Design a protein around this ligand. Structure first.
Ligand SMILES: O=C(O)[C@H]1CS[C@@H]2CS[C@@H](CS)N12
Ligand SMILES: O=C(O)[C@H]1CS[C@@H]2CS[C@@H](CS)N12
Ligand SMILES: [Zn+2]
Ligand SMILES: [Zn+2]
Length: 219
């Protein structure tokens, strides 16, 4: 059977949640997201694959005295949005970019209740920032920046050992978007990818290199 949901401290007021799903043609896929604590309030950065793991994640932090103020999804794939329907049914505010919500809608999936558009957005002013580097892994991928800890959640945009599933990717744009990502957050202390281990700012370098190499290889 599949591994249980994992919750691990990464830094002060910052936890990594890891959930697991069997995906056809991929085998068992790990997915990392974060839980960010601001005072006594918690923010989900990406939901687990399932409502079950989302519920478990929420209860773990609620049982420890944290109010769940919201979740934000970094792109539309279920690995980031799987728990939105369950969160909505609990009246926990869900966030996604306008484009992410359009893509959820187009696929007949439940949308987040709050949307944002533009290159930058503060989910929490001075604490949790959202940034759109451009198309890459998907047209809508965004990253999440924690300035106080210098932690960058790169999600499925960060792909140091190969680009992974290209079904919705924009291979033409990814090098440019990754370049933009590298400049803005080159000083990242920690970078958290969706499907591999936490690294440092070099993960931005490797992603850029992998993207460049993928576009060339496609020609
Ligand atoms: O709101 C929507 O876009 C569609 C897709 S998923 C969401 C909940 S059930 C369905 C209307 S019956 N509905
Ligand atoms: O993120 C990706 O590129 C691939 C690698 S593991 C998982 C299988 S399909 C896609 C959903 S985010 N994803
Ligand atoms: Zn994805
Ligand atoms: Zn992914």
């Amino acid at each position: 059977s599949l591994p249980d949901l994992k919750i691990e401290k990464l830094d002060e007021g910052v936890y990594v949640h890891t959930s697991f799903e069997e995906v056809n043609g991929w085998g068992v896929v790990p997915k990392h997201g974060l839980v960010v604590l601001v005072n006594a309030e918690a923010y989900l950065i990406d939901t687990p694959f399932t409502a079950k793991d989302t519920e478990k994640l929420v209860t773990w932090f609620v049982e420890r005295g944290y109010k769940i103020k919201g979740s934000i999804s970094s792109h539309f794939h279920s690995d980031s949005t799987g728990g939105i329907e369950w969160l909505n049914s609990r009246s926990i505010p869900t966030y996604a970019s306008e484009l992410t919500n359009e893509l959820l809608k187009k696929d007949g999936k439940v949308q987040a209740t709050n949307s944002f558009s533009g290159v930058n957005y503060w989910l929490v002013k001075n604490k949790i920032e959202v940034f759109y580097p451009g198309p890459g892994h998907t047209p809508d991928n965004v990253v999440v920046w924690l300035p106080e800890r210098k932690i960058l959640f790169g999600g499925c945009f960060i792909k140091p050992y190969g680009l992974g599933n290209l079904g919705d990717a924009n291979i033409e744009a990814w090098p440019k978007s990754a370049k933009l990502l590298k400049s803005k957050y080159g000083k990242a202390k920690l970078v958290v990818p969706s499907h591999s281990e936490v690294g440092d700012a070099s993960l931005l370098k490797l992603t850029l290199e992998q993207a460049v190499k993928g576009l060339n290889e496609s020609k």
